Design a binder for this molecule. Structure first.
Ligand SMILES: CC(=O)N[C@@H]1[C@@H](O)[C@H](O[C@@H]2O[C@H](CO)[C@@H](O[C@@H]3O[C@H](CO)[C@@H](O[C@@H]4O[C@H](CO)[C@@H](O[C@@H]5O[C@H](CO)[C@@H](O)[C@H](O)[C@H]5NC(C)=O)[C@H](O[C@H](C)C(=O)O)[C@H]4NC(C)=O)[C@H](O)[C@H]3NC(C)=O)[C@H](O[C@H](C)C(=O)O)[C@H]2NC(C)=O)[C@@H](CO)O[C@H]1O
Ligand SMILES: [Ca+2]
Length: 273
């Protein structure tokens, strides 16, 4: 088959030596790589920029004529990634080379047969500060109709976290928005944990770290990200080949999702970044 789906909760991706390169989530769809050798035990695959090997034990073959395969599609204004059958995210502006309503396929969301995307937020150095002020960040809640968020009116805390830890506050807002449903998930409300800190796939709620209050949750999560990712040379969102997404999340499109939120916020606030 050309496409395979991940069966267990997570599955590893390996190099030719059998060394672990990353891990990907249940239901993820990987492409068979016909330029490398597969055998009975391991398939040469590509996923979210990463070319490696997966155990056949962890995979189920798909039929693209009846099973969902992730794809990209333009509405004539934005290009969307269908990451699941009923969920899309905007990744880029429409390019004249895109046919509206045509499904496109890409192993990295950057290289397509007929055009190339820039996803600048996906590769932006997260140690560079946002050009948004605390007051501008606070405006996003009204502009994106975000109701009942624990993060409302916390722009000043995001900017303090940026000042102190040298981590982009637009990224911190977008990461908390995506990971905790704008500070409305049960982990957010119970644990003041807006960033999925130690929310492991096997037991996400139980494993998630606890913080004392909303401000200590924003500052403590920022500290944790700085010490565990930025200071260890993971300085951009990325994908399964490089960046924070290699280790931070099993979801192969975690980085693309956060970059999409950054893109949406930046457009609403006037394009300063
Ligand atoms: C279309 C769209 O936009 N959809 C949105 C939707 O995505 C939103 O929902 C949110 O989705 C997120 C994924 O995109 C999901 O992310 C989860 O987040 C945590 C943190 O990122 C992550 O946890 C990782 O788990 C692994 C284990 O599986 C750990 O790796 C282990 O670490 C051990 C110790 O270091 C090590 O011994 C083990 O060997 C290793 N295991 C493996 C297999 O390698 C990670 O630990 C790392 C390595 C570390 O210590 O640094 C751990 N990361 C961290 C930082 O702790 C999950 O993988 C990830 N899940 C997926 C599928 O990616 C959000 O989940 C949150 C946390 C939650 O469950 O509440 C999810 N949020 C919600 C609210 O559902 C959605 C929001 O509503 O919005 C949609 O629009
Ligand atoms: Ca190696």
């Amino acid at each position: 088959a050309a496409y395979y789906q991940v069966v267990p909760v997570t599955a590893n991706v390996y190099d030719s030596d059998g060394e672990k390169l990353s891990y990907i989530s249940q239901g993820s769809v990987v492409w068979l790589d016909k330029d490398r050798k597969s055998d009975d035990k391991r398939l040469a695959i590509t996923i979210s920029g990463l070319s490696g090997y997966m155990k056949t034990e962890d995979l189920q073959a798909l039929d693209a004529s009846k099973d969902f395969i992730p794809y990209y599609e333009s509405d004539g204004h934005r290009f969307y990634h269908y990451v699941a059958q009923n969920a899309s995210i905007p990744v880029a502006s429409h390019l004249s080379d895109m046919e509206v309503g045509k499904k496109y396929y890409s192993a990295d969301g950057l290289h397509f047969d007929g055009f190339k995307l820039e996803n600048p937020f996906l590769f932006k150095d997260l140690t560079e500060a946002t050009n948004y002020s605390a007051e501008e960040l606070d405006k996003v809640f009204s502009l994106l109709n975000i109701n009942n968020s624990l993060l409302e009116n916390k722009g000043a805390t995001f900017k303090e976290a940026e000042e102190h830890y040298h981590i982009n506050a637009l990224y911190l807002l977008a990461h908390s928005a995506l990971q905790s449903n704008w500070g409305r998930s049960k982990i957010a409300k119970d644990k003041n944990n807006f960033f999925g800190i130690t929310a492991y796939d096997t037991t996400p709620y139980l494993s998630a770290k606890t913080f004392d209050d909303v401000d200590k949750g924003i500052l403590g999560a920022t500290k944790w990200i700085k010490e565990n990712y930025i200071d260890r040379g993971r300085t951009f969102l990325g994908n399964k080949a490089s960046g924070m997404n290699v280790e931070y999340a099993s979801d192969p499109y975690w980085g693309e999702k956060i970059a999409s939120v950054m893109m949406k916020i930046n457009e609403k606030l006037g394009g300063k970044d």
